[PDB]
PDB file of C-alpha atoms in Angstrom:
ATOM      1  CA  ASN A   2      -7.753 -21.167  19.856  1.00  0.00           C
ATOM      2  CA  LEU A   3      -7.385 -18.825  16.858  1.00  0.00           C
ATOM      3  CA  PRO A   4      -7.412 -15.115  17.910  1.00  0.00           C
ATOM      4  CA  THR A   5     -10.748 -13.329  17.376  1.00  0.00           C
ATOM      5  CA  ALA A   6     -11.105 -10.218  15.187  1.00  0.00           C
ATOM      6  CA  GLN A   7     -10.854  -8.058  18.301  1.00  0.00           C
ATOM      7  CA  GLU A   8      -7.668  -9.697  19.549  1.00  0.00           C
ATOM      8  CA  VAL A   9      -6.025  -9.500  16.155  1.00  0.00           C
ATOM      9  CA  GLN A  10      -6.722  -5.741  16.155  1.00  0.00           C
ATOM     10  CA  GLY A  11      -5.087  -5.618  19.568  1.00  0.00           C
ATOM     11  CA  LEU A  12      -2.036  -7.652  18.636  1.00  0.00           C
ATOM     12  CA  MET A  13      -1.297  -5.867  15.355  1.00  0.00           C
ATOM     13  CA  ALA A  14      -1.490  -2.437  17.003  1.00  0.00           C
ATOM     14  CA  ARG A  15       0.864  -3.626  19.769  1.00  0.00           C
ATOM     15  CA  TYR A  16       3.359  -4.771  17.128  1.00  0.00           C
ATOM     16  CA  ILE A  17       3.502  -1.248  15.698  1.00  0.00           C
ATOM     17  CA  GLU A  18       4.139   0.128  19.207  1.00  0.00           C
ATOM     18  CA  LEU A  19       7.071  -2.231  19.710  1.00  0.00           C
ATOM     19  CA  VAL A  20       8.552  -1.332  16.357  1.00  0.00           C
ATOM     20  CA  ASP A  21       8.168   2.357  17.151  1.00  0.00           C
ATOM     21  CA  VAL A  22      10.203   1.961  20.346  1.00  0.00           C
ATOM     22  CA  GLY A  23      12.652  -0.533  18.851  1.00  0.00           C
ATOM     23  CA  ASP A  24      11.989  -3.273  21.391  1.00  0.00           C
ATOM     24  CA  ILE A  25      13.529  -6.040  19.299  1.00  0.00           C
ATOM     25  CA  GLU A  26      13.184  -8.624  22.026  1.00  0.00           C
ATOM     26  CA  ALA A  27       9.438  -8.044  22.354  1.00  0.00           C
ATOM     27  CA  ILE A  28       8.966  -7.896  18.583  1.00  0.00           C
ATOM     28  CA  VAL A  29      10.789 -11.210  18.099  1.00  0.00           C
ATOM     29  CA  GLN A  30       8.732 -12.438  21.037  1.00  0.00           C
ATOM     30  CA  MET A  31       5.546 -11.913  19.034  1.00  0.00           C
ATOM     31  CA  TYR A  32       6.579 -14.349  16.268  1.00  0.00           C
ATOM     32  CA  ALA A  33       6.227 -18.117  16.178  1.00  0.00           C
ATOM     33  CA  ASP A  34       9.698 -19.630  15.966  1.00  0.00           C
ATOM     34  CA  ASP A  35       8.989 -20.971  12.463  1.00  0.00           C
ATOM     35  CA  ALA A  36       7.332 -17.753  11.294  1.00  0.00           C
ATOM     36  CA  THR A  37       8.227 -16.147   7.983  1.00  0.00           C
ATOM     37  CA  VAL A  38       8.584 -12.499   7.131  1.00  0.00           C
ATOM     38  CA  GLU A  39       8.379 -11.074   3.603  1.00  0.00           C
ATOM     39  CA  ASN A  40       9.470  -7.492   3.648  1.00  0.00           C
ATOM     40  CA  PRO A  41       9.220  -6.067   1.139  1.00  0.00           C
ATOM     41  CA  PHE A  42       6.757  -8.436  -0.363  1.00  0.00           C
ATOM     42  CA  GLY A  43       8.433  -9.879  -3.406  1.00  0.00           C
ATOM     43  CA  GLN A  44      11.772 -10.533  -1.755  1.00  0.00           C
ATOM     44  CA  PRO A  45      12.619 -14.070  -0.527  1.00  0.00           C
ATOM     45  CA  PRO A  46      11.122 -14.799   2.934  1.00  0.00           C
ATOM     46  CA  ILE A  47      13.253 -14.663   6.037  1.00  0.00           C
ATOM     47  CA  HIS A  48      12.751 -17.772   8.183  1.00  0.00           C
ATOM     48  CA  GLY A  49      12.731 -18.358  11.918  1.00  0.00           C
ATOM     49  CA  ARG A  50      13.397 -16.319  15.029  1.00  0.00           C
ATOM     50  CA  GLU A  51      17.124 -16.001  14.531  1.00  0.00           C
ATOM     51  CA  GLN A  52      17.040 -14.404  11.088  1.00  0.00           C
ATOM     52  CA  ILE A  53      14.033 -12.284  12.075  1.00  0.00           C
ATOM     53  CA  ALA A  54      15.829 -10.810  15.052  1.00  0.00           C
ATOM     54  CA  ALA A  55      18.735  -9.878  12.744  1.00  0.00           C
ATOM     55  CA  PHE A  56      16.338  -8.367  10.238  1.00  0.00           C
ATOM     56  CA  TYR A  57      14.824  -6.161  12.936  1.00  0.00           C
ATOM     57  CA  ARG A  58      18.308  -5.591  14.322  1.00  0.00           C
ATOM     58  CA  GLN A  59      19.625  -4.228  11.021  1.00  0.00           C
ATOM     59  CA  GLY A  60      16.258  -2.684  10.172  1.00  0.00           C
ATOM     60  CA  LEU A  61      16.065  -0.739  13.414  1.00  0.00           C
ATOM     61  CA  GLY A  62      19.833  -0.275  13.325  1.00  0.00           C
ATOM     62  CA  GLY A  63      21.329   3.083  12.406  1.00  0.00           C
ATOM     63  CA  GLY A  64      18.511   5.194  11.013  1.00  0.00           C
ATOM     64  CA  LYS A  65      16.190   6.388  13.754  1.00  0.00           C
ATOM     65  CA  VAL A  66      12.943   4.534  13.065  1.00  0.00           C
ATOM     66  CA  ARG A  67       9.412   5.561  14.059  1.00  0.00           C
ATOM     67  CA  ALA A  68       6.257   3.725  13.060  1.00  0.00           C
ATOM     68  CA  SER A  69       2.617   4.686  13.561  1.00  0.00           C
ATOM     69  CA  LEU A  70      -0.782   3.272  12.651  1.00  0.00           C
ATOM     70  CA  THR A  71      -2.482   5.566  10.142  1.00  0.00           C
ATOM     71  CA  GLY A  72      -5.846   3.794  10.165  1.00  0.00           C
ATOM     72  CA  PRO A  73      -7.937   1.059  11.777  1.00  0.00           C
ATOM     73  CA  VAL A  74      -6.626  -2.517  11.730  1.00  0.00           C
ATOM     74  CA  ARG A  75      -8.761  -4.581   9.366  1.00  0.00           C
ATOM     75  CA  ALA A  76      -9.297  -7.954  10.999  1.00  0.00           C
ATOM     76  CA  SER A  77     -10.865 -11.173   9.737  1.00  0.00           C
ATOM     77  CA  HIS A  78     -12.588 -13.943  11.663  1.00  0.00           C
ATOM     78  CA  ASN A  79      -9.862 -16.441  10.785  1.00  0.00           C
ATOM     79  CA  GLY A  80      -6.890 -15.151  12.780  1.00  0.00           C
ATOM     80  CA  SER A  81      -5.644 -12.799  10.018  1.00  0.00           C
ATOM     81  CA  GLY A  82      -5.564  -9.037   9.540  1.00  0.00           C
ATOM     82  CA  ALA A  83      -4.006  -6.099   7.662  1.00  0.00           C
ATOM     83  CA  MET A  84      -3.135  -2.516   8.684  1.00  0.00           C
ATOM     84  CA  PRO A  85      -1.731   0.717   7.199  1.00  0.00           C
ATOM     85  CA  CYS A  86       1.158   2.508   8.853  1.00  0.00           C
ATOM     86  CA  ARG A  87       3.747   5.135   8.111  1.00  0.00           C
ATOM     87  CA  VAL A  88       7.406   4.456   8.845  1.00  0.00           C
ATOM     88  CA  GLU A  89       9.791   7.359   9.454  1.00  0.00           C
ATOM     89  CA  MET A  90      13.495   6.796   8.919  1.00  0.00           C
ATOM     90  CA  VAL A  91      16.648   7.915   7.178  1.00  0.00           C
ATOM     91  CA  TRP A  92      17.004   6.720   3.609  1.00  0.00           C
ATOM     92  CA  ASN A  93      19.758   7.450   1.137  1.00  0.00           C
ATOM     93  CA  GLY A  94      21.042  10.042   3.543  1.00  0.00           C
ATOM     94  CA  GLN A  95      17.653  11.677   3.955  1.00  0.00           C
ATOM     95  CA  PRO A  96      14.908  11.722   6.548  1.00  0.00           C
ATOM     96  CA  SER A  97      12.145   9.937   4.672  1.00  0.00           C
ATOM     97  CA  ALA A  98       8.651   8.581   5.198  1.00  0.00           C
ATOM     98  CA  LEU A  99       7.467   5.219   3.862  1.00  0.00           C
ATOM     99  CA  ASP A 100       3.837   4.183   3.514  1.00  0.00           C
ATOM    100  CA  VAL A 101       3.341   0.510   4.258  1.00  0.00           C
ATOM    101  CA  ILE A 102       0.577  -2.030   4.705  1.00  0.00           C
ATOM    102  CA  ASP A 103       1.414  -5.107   6.825  1.00  0.00           C
ATOM    103  CA  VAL A 104      -0.623  -8.323   6.482  1.00  0.00           C
ATOM    104  CA  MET A 105      -0.369 -10.831   9.323  1.00  0.00           C
ATOM    105  CA  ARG A 106      -1.607 -14.350  10.041  1.00  0.00           C
ATOM    106  CA  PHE A 107      -1.544 -15.622  13.636  1.00  0.00           C
ATOM    107  CA  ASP A 108      -1.387 -19.148  15.008  1.00  0.00           C
ATOM    108  CA  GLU A 109      -3.574 -20.680  17.692  1.00  0.00           C
ATOM    109  CA  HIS A 110      -1.191 -19.357  20.362  1.00  0.00           C
ATOM    110  CA  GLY A 111      -1.620 -15.799  19.099  1.00  0.00           C
ATOM    111  CA  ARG A 112       1.882 -15.665  17.569  1.00  0.00           C
ATOM    112  CA  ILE A 113       2.586 -14.188  14.138  1.00  0.00           C
ATOM    113  CA  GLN A 114       2.993 -17.123  11.774  1.00  0.00           C
ATOM    114  CA  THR A 115       3.333 -15.062   8.598  1.00  0.00           C
ATOM    115  CA  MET A 116       4.053 -11.389   7.977  1.00  0.00           C
ATOM    116  CA  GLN A 117       4.107  -9.526   4.649  1.00  0.00           C
ATOM    117  CA  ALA A 118       4.995  -5.867   4.208  1.00  0.00           C
ATOM    118  CA  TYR A 119       3.576  -4.183   1.069  1.00  0.00           C
ATOM    119  CA  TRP A 120       5.533  -1.123  -0.095  1.00  0.00           C
ATOM    120  CA  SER A 121       8.079   0.019  -2.651  1.00  0.00           C
ATOM    121  CA  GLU A 122       9.920   3.173  -3.719  1.00  0.00           C
ATOM    122  CA  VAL A 123       6.659   4.635  -5.093  1.00  0.00           C
ATOM    123  CA  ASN A 124       5.480   4.793  -1.434  1.00  0.00           C
ATOM    124  CA  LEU A 125       8.627   6.651  -0.476  1.00  0.00           C
ATOM    125  CA  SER A 126       8.652  10.356   0.358  1.00  0.00           C
ATOM    126  CA  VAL A 127      11.760  12.334   1.175  1.00  0.00           C
ATOM    127  CA  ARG A 128      11.264  15.190   3.586  1.00  0.00           C
ATOM    128  CA  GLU A 129      12.815  18.583   2.931  1.00  0.00           C
ATOM    129  CA  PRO A 130      14.702  20.484   5.663  1.00  0.00           C
TER     130      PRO A 130
ATOM    131  CA  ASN B   2       5.594  -8.612 -18.368  1.00  0.00           C
ATOM    132  CA  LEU B   3       4.642  -8.249 -14.670  1.00  0.00           C
ATOM    133  CA  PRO B   4       3.164  -4.797 -13.848  1.00  0.00           C
ATOM    134  CA  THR B   5       5.551  -2.265 -12.327  1.00  0.00           C
ATOM    135  CA  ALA B   6       4.904  -0.651  -8.949  1.00  0.00           C
ATOM    136  CA  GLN B   7       3.565   2.429 -10.781  1.00  0.00           C
ATOM    137  CA  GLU B   8       1.159   0.455 -12.898  1.00  0.00           C
ATOM    138  CA  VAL B   9      -0.109  -1.566  -9.963  1.00  0.00           C
ATOM    139  CA  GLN B  10      -0.912   1.749  -8.239  1.00  0.00           C
ATOM    140  CA  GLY B  11      -2.805   2.783 -11.345  1.00  0.00           C
ATOM    141  CA  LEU B  12      -4.748  -0.466 -11.736  1.00  0.00           C
ATOM    142  CA  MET B  13      -5.859  -0.822  -8.114  1.00  0.00           C
ATOM    143  CA  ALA B  14      -7.077   2.777  -8.025  1.00  0.00           C
ATOM    144  CA  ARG B  15      -9.035   2.217 -11.236  1.00  0.00           C
ATOM    145  CA  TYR B  16     -10.682  -0.866  -9.689  1.00  0.00           C
ATOM    146  CA  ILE B  17     -12.012   1.260  -6.816  1.00  0.00           C
ATOM    147  CA  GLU B  18     -13.423   3.717  -9.365  1.00  0.00           C
ATOM    148  CA  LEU B  19     -15.274   0.990 -11.187  1.00  0.00           C
ATOM    149  CA  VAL B  20     -16.706  -0.414  -7.973  1.00  0.00           C
ATOM    150  CA  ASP B  21     -17.838   3.072  -6.971  1.00  0.00           C
ATOM    151  CA  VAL B  22     -19.831   3.447 -10.176  1.00  0.00           C
ATOM    152  CA  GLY B  23     -20.989  -0.176 -10.252  1.00  0.00           C
ATOM    153  CA  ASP B  24     -19.543  -0.969 -13.670  1.00  0.00           C
ATOM    154  CA  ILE B  25     -19.710  -4.750 -13.259  1.00  0.00           C
ATOM    155  CA  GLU B  26     -18.649  -5.429 -16.806  1.00  0.00           C
ATOM    156  CA  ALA B  27     -15.437  -3.416 -16.437  1.00  0.00           C
ATOM    157  CA  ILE B  28     -14.753  -4.831 -12.972  1.00  0.00           C
ATOM    158  CA  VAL B  29     -15.156  -8.395 -14.205  1.00  0.00           C
ATOM    159  CA  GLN B  30     -13.024  -7.313 -17.138  1.00  0.00           C
ATOM    160  CA  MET B  31     -10.114  -6.547 -14.802  1.00  0.00           C
ATOM    161  CA  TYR B  32      -9.875 -10.152 -13.541  1.00  0.00           C
ATOM    162  CA  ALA B  33      -8.128 -13.108 -15.171  1.00  0.00           C
ATOM    163  CA  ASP B  34     -10.730 -15.746 -16.031  1.00  0.00           C
ATOM    164  CA  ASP B  35      -9.248 -18.161 -13.503  1.00  0.00           C
ATOM    165  CA  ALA B  36      -8.865 -15.468 -10.809  1.00  0.00           C
ATOM    166  CA  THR B  37      -9.911 -16.052  -7.213  1.00  0.00           C
ATOM    167  CA  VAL B  38     -11.672 -13.670  -4.854  1.00  0.00           C
ATOM    168  CA  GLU B  39     -11.708 -14.085  -1.078  1.00  0.00           C
ATOM    169  CA  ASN B  40     -14.095 -11.556   0.367  1.00  0.00           C
ATOM    170  CA  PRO B  41     -14.156 -11.437   3.278  1.00  0.00           C
ATOM    171  CA  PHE B  42     -10.817 -13.136   3.677  1.00  0.00           C
ATOM    172  CA  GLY B  43     -11.583 -16.295   5.642  1.00  0.00           C
ATOM    173  CA  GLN B  44     -14.533 -17.319   3.553  1.00  0.00           C
ATOM    174  CA  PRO B  45     -14.084 -19.927   0.753  1.00  0.00           C
ATOM    175  CA  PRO B  46     -12.734 -18.425  -2.499  1.00  0.00           C
ATOM    176  CA  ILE B  47     -14.987 -17.654  -5.399  1.00  0.00           C
ATOM    177  CA  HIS B  48     -13.526 -18.999  -8.631  1.00  0.00           C
ATOM    178  CA  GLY B  49     -13.603 -17.703 -12.179  1.00  0.00           C
ATOM    179  CA  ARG B  50     -15.284 -14.892 -14.075  1.00  0.00           C
ATOM    180  CA  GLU B  51     -18.806 -16.265 -13.898  1.00  0.00           C
ATOM    181  CA  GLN B  52     -19.006 -16.556 -10.111  1.00  0.00           C
ATOM    182  CA  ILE B  53     -17.137 -13.265  -9.690  1.00  0.00           C
ATOM    183  CA  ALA B  54     -19.647 -11.415 -11.856  1.00  0.00           C
ATOM    184  CA  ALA B  55     -22.465 -12.800  -9.701  1.00  0.00           C
ATOM    185  CA  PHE B  56     -20.602 -11.779  -6.575  1.00  0.00           C
ATOM    186  CA  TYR B  57     -20.305  -8.205  -7.831  1.00  0.00           C
ATOM    187  CA  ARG B  58     -23.858  -8.470  -9.091  1.00  0.00           C
ATOM    188  CA  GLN B  59     -25.245  -9.377  -5.689  1.00  0.00           C
ATOM    189  CA  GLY B  60     -22.661  -7.283  -3.872  1.00  0.00           C
ATOM    190  CA  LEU B  61     -23.549  -4.144  -5.842  1.00  0.00           C
ATOM    191  CA  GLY B  62     -27.184  -5.232  -5.939  1.00  0.00           C
ATOM    192  CA  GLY B  63     -29.773  -3.523  -3.758  1.00  0.00           C
ATOM    193  CA  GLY B  64     -27.847  -1.408  -1.278  1.00  0.00           C
ATOM    194  CA  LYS B  65     -26.423   1.685  -2.928  1.00  0.00           C
ATOM    195  CA  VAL B  66     -22.650   1.096  -2.837  1.00  0.00           C
ATOM    196  CA  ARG B  67     -19.876   3.696  -2.895  1.00  0.00           C
ATOM    197  CA  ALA B  68     -16.184   2.955  -2.449  1.00  0.00           C
ATOM    198  CA  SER B  69     -13.266   5.370  -2.155  1.00  0.00           C
ATOM    199  CA  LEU B  70      -9.529   5.126  -1.641  1.00  0.00           C
ATOM    200  CA  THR B  71      -8.641   6.510   1.776  1.00  0.00           C
ATOM    201  CA  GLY B  72      -4.853   6.383   1.373  1.00  0.00           C
ATOM    202  CA  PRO B  73      -2.042   5.647  -1.107  1.00  0.00           C
ATOM    203  CA  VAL B  74      -1.846   2.250  -2.808  1.00  0.00           C
ATOM    204  CA  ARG B  75       1.123   0.310  -1.422  1.00  0.00           C
ATOM    205  CA  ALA B  76       2.717  -1.381  -4.404  1.00  0.00           C
ATOM    206  CA  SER B  77       5.481  -3.959  -4.485  1.00  0.00           C
ATOM    207  CA  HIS B  78       7.925  -4.600  -7.356  1.00  0.00           C
ATOM    208  CA  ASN B  79       6.572  -8.111  -7.952  1.00  0.00           C
ATOM    209  CA  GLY B  80       3.136  -7.376  -9.431  1.00  0.00           C
ATOM    210  CA  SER B  81       1.311  -7.196  -6.060  1.00  0.00           C
ATOM    211  CA  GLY B  82      -0.197  -4.418  -3.981  1.00  0.00           C
ATOM    212  CA  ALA B  83      -2.541  -3.464  -1.169  1.00  0.00           C
ATOM    213  CA  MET B  84      -4.822  -0.500  -0.507  1.00  0.00           C
ATOM    214  CA  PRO B  85      -7.191   0.947   2.156  1.00  0.00           C
ATOM    215  CA  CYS B  86     -10.666   2.048   1.196  1.00  0.00           C
ATOM    216  CA  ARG B  87     -13.996   2.806   2.791  1.00  0.00           C
ATOM    217  CA  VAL B  88     -17.164   1.211   1.488  1.00  0.00           C
ATOM    218  CA  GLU B  89     -20.526   2.939   1.958  1.00  0.00           C
ATOM    219  CA  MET B  90     -23.637   0.795   1.797  1.00  0.00           C
ATOM    220  CA  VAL B  91     -26.842  -0.290   3.518  1.00  0.00           C
ATOM    221  CA  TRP B  92     -26.402  -3.000   6.135  1.00  0.00           C
ATOM    222  CA  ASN B  93     -29.002  -4.577   8.346  1.00  0.00           C
ATOM    223  CA  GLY B  94     -31.388  -1.875   7.251  1.00  0.00           C
ATOM    224  CA  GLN B  95     -28.924   0.907   7.976  1.00  0.00           C
ATOM    225  CA  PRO B  96     -26.639   3.166   5.958  1.00  0.00           C
ATOM    226  CA  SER B  97     -23.271   1.912   7.137  1.00  0.00           C
ATOM    227  CA  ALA B  98     -19.570   2.344   6.395  1.00  0.00           C
ATOM    228  CA  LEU B  99     -17.097  -0.497   6.184  1.00  0.00           C
ATOM    229  CA  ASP B 100     -13.316  -0.096   6.407  1.00  0.00           C
ATOM    230  CA  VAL B 101     -11.493  -2.521   4.115  1.00  0.00           C
ATOM    231  CA  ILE B 102      -8.023  -3.312   2.841  1.00  0.00           C
ATOM    232  CA  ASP B 103      -7.808  -5.103  -0.517  1.00  0.00           C
ATOM    233  CA  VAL B 104      -4.705  -7.101  -1.476  1.00  0.00           C
ATOM    234  CA  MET B 105      -4.198  -7.914  -5.155  1.00  0.00           C
ATOM    235  CA  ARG B 106      -1.776  -9.955  -7.201  1.00  0.00           C
ATOM    236  CA  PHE B 107      -1.634  -9.272 -10.957  1.00  0.00           C
ATOM    237  CA  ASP B 108      -0.616 -11.573 -13.811  1.00  0.00           C
ATOM    238  CA  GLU B 109       1.736 -10.799 -16.672  1.00  0.00           C
ATOM    239  CA  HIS B 110      -1.216  -9.413 -18.641  1.00  0.00           C
ATOM    240  CA  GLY B 111      -2.079  -6.895 -15.931  1.00  0.00           C
ATOM    241  CA  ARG B 112      -5.183  -8.821 -14.849  1.00  0.00           C
ATOM    242  CA  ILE B 113      -6.111  -9.524 -11.215  1.00  0.00           C
ATOM    243  CA  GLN B 114      -5.148 -13.103 -10.474  1.00  0.00           C
ATOM    244  CA  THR B 115      -5.946 -13.031  -6.775  1.00  0.00           C
ATOM    245  CA  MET B 116      -7.954 -10.650  -4.613  1.00  0.00           C
ATOM    246  CA  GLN B 117      -8.436 -10.695  -0.814  1.00  0.00           C
ATOM    247  CA  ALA B 118     -10.601  -8.248   1.091  1.00  0.00           C
ATOM    248  CA  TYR B 119      -9.698  -7.849   4.788  1.00  0.00           C
ATOM    249  CA  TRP B 120     -12.549  -6.703   7.022  1.00  0.00           C
ATOM    250  CA  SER B 121     -15.062  -7.974   9.539  1.00  0.00           C
ATOM    251  CA  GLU B 122     -17.859  -6.599  11.737  1.00  0.00           C
ATOM    252  CA  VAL B 123     -15.311  -4.781  13.929  1.00  0.00           C
ATOM    253  CA  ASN B 124     -14.634  -2.582  10.870  1.00  0.00           C
ATOM    254  CA  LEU B 125     -18.309  -1.791  10.525  1.00  0.00           C
ATOM    255  CA  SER B 126     -19.796   1.580  11.508  1.00  0.00           C
ATOM    256  CA  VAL B 127     -23.497   2.369  11.375  1.00  0.00           C
ATOM    257  CA  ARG B 128     -24.242   5.973  10.426  1.00  0.00           C
ATOM    258  CA  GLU B 129     -26.746   8.107  12.405  1.00  0.00           C
ATOM    259  CA  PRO B 130     -29.523  10.211  10.771  1.00  0.00           C
TER     260      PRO B 130
END
């Protein structure tokens, strides 16, 4: 059955953990095999487990990447939710911080069926040494 | 043309202002006439300016309602964005606070074409004396 509000809060916080540690296997594990990821929202979706793994491979490849929840997960009663996080990584040769909000819909097996990441360069902050 | 990241940031912050002051006319003004609101996401959409006005009428009717941005607006390059806010109002006879994340898609005239508010009772906090 479709994940309750509570469970969605649990699942979306766990996803941020996994991203923080770079556990690509576990991250990919969280997605339905026909899931889609739009990141950043606006770009063409990436489809299916194989492409997604590569996305997270390249994404978490090279620049050291931390992610942390910066507020409560907002969760609906229909297996969806949205959350704000801050992603630390190297951009354009500089340690930078990116503010993001991820929106996720889960299937009846508690897998991510759809993910969208809202952010752009306006949410981008370069850190001084 | 479709609103830039910067403009989206501006528009979504202005919406929160208007809600905070209860300017229903201006709020309704921000929406396309064929816009849809899902609030809370999961419930059936409300369609068009007339129903929307009533929604904001009832919504901002009775319980004193404040709303404030609690972090940066995440804005994409394709006329969409998402933001976190905290809504103060009276629920179930009690001054309460609700954590929300609104997701908005704008049209080429800078009007809100689609709004979704993510929150449920798990995001609800009742305030003591």
